Design a protein around this ligand. Sequence first.
Ligand SMILES: *[C@@H]1O[C@H](CO[C@@H]2O[C@@H](C)[C@@H](O)[C@@H](O)[C@@H]2O)[C@@H](O[C@@H]2O[C@H](CO)[C@@H](O)[C@H](O)[C@H]2NC(C)=O)[C@H](O)[C@H]1NC(C)=O
Ligand SMILES: *[C@@H]1O[C@H](CO[C@@H]2O[C@@H](C)[C@@H](O)[C@@H](O)[C@@H]2O)[C@@H](O[C@@H]2O[C@H](CO)[C@@H](O)[C@H](O)[C@H]2NC(C)=O)[C@H](O)[C@H]1NC(C)=O
Lengths: 218, 98
Amino acid sequence: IVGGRRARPHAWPFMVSLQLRGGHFCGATLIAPNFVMSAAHCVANVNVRAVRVVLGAHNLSRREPTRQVFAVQRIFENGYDPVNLLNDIVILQLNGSATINANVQVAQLPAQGRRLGNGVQCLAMGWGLLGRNRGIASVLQELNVTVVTSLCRRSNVCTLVRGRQAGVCFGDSGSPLVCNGLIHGIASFVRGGCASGLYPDAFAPVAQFVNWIDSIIQ
Amino acid sequence: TRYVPYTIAVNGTSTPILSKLKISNKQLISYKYLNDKVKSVLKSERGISDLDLKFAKQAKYTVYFKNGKKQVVNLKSDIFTPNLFSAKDIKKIDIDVK
Ligand SMILES: *[C@@H]1O[C@H](CO[C@@H]2O[C@@H](C)[C@@H](O)[C@@H](O)[C@@H]2O)[C@@H](O[C@@H]2O[C@H](CO)[C@@H](O)[C@H](O)[C@H]2NC(C)=O)[C@H](O)[C@H]1NC(C)=O
Ligand SMILES: *[C@@H]1O[C@H](CO[C@@H]2O[C@@H](C)[C@@H](O)[C@@H](O)[C@@H]2O)[C@@H](O[C@@H]2O[C@H](CO)[C@@H](O)[C@H](O)[C@H]2NC(C)=O)[C@H](O)[C@H]1NC(C)=O
């Protein structure tokens, strides 16, 4: 996240870090005690067995006792199209169920088909790069963003920080967009590089997949 | 440091040498980072600059991962997925410009 602020510790207890042996590579959202939701492009080319799912984290540089760590048993997709970046959503089933506490909680999703209009105020978040030429965040970052319909397409939810070079960056893929307390987006792609100040960030539109999501997690 | 095999094909033509590019394994990398590395060898080894690629009919590379997966990257696109991956999982990179 470029141009954001530190989240308060465990303010977003549904927030998930997906990690390889080399550490954090994508975000995700806890959507049931045994399921997380991310971007399909995050795991398209990785070995499912190499992924560690880290819940309850705040500072990735610390050994936090709040954390619960799971493996991935299998993934579920729904028509991911890498060429057109359509349906960029994946559900990862965990090898167990998280224990719900102050620091690890299930997110709430919108109703199927709900669309956000131009100007709705949302919050993006993640541990991605702090700037175009910087390293990944240690502390979870958040950023006030606004939904825009210009320079977007109907297949995405797009967000912008007007007048500022601020936005998601590498390592933020798969992270949630929170609007009105509900997860409306999954970070999918940027245009013109990170934090261009010219083009909005594109999120996978979660509300279009709610029926599907519910069938997997039941 | 990791040395990744790569080949360059320009207008269908490929060469018989073996070449490797130096990639950092100190942290996870992005496709923006990999684009810069690919463009670096296109410039040094073929005289194809960043602006030359804007006028090419096609400019892409394919990352082959050791698990048999692959990702095709269009070098003429300024759209990036903001994910990270390990350079150690890269088997080879096939660079193709026309
Ligand atoms: C569910 O999986 C976790 C995580 O397993 C680790 O991460 C995976 C991606 C894979 O790399 C595994 O080989 C890793 O061990 C299990 O937690 C591990 O459990 C073992 C055995 O008790 C323990 O020695 C490790 O230290 C644990 N690792 C962590 C990070 O906690 C967990 O046991 C699994 N749960 C079930 C019910 O199978
Ligand atoms: C910046 O955003 C915060 C948080 O936004 C709200 O909470 C997110 C999780 C998401 O649901 C968004 O759609 C929400 O708008 C704003 O904090 C809120 O501020 C109002 C007014 O001061 C207050 O009544 C709420 O309690 C706050 N909510 C939380 C969760 O703290 C903040 O106002 C925004 N700032 C700007 C300048 O837009």
